[PDB]
Amino acid sequence: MSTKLYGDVNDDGKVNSTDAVALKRYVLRSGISINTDNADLNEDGRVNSTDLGILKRYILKEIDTLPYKNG
């Protein structure tokens, strides 16, 4: 009916360290199944470290818009 998430791995909430498991598998190659659709936002794939941060940064609670920023 309604949900808020952007770039989820296991469609839990978002792609972060928590989804590092599927990440390691994804980083190595494309074998698993993840919502890579809107998982990448810097042509990386998911969260190599640049997004990971912004993720744990916005996913902290702001999870709704995600103030995508560099750092």
Q: Does 27 bind Ca ion (CB under 5 A)?
A: no
Report, in Å, the least distance between residue 1 CB and Ca ion. Answer: 20
55 annotated as a binding-site residue: no
DSSP codes of every residue in 14-43: -SSGGGHHHHHHHHH-S-S---GGGT-SSS
d(CA 71, CA 64): 20
13 annotated as a binding-site residue: yes
Q: Does 44 bind Ca ion (CB under 5 A)?
A: yes
d(CA 58, CA 4): 12
One of 27, 32, 41, 63 touching Ca ion (CB under 5 A): 41
Report, in Å, the least distance between residue 41 CB and Ca ion. Answer: 5
Q: Is 11 helix (H, G, I), strand (E, B) or coil?
A: coil
**Residues within the interface to Ca ion (CB under 5 A):** 12-13, 19, 40-42, 44, 51
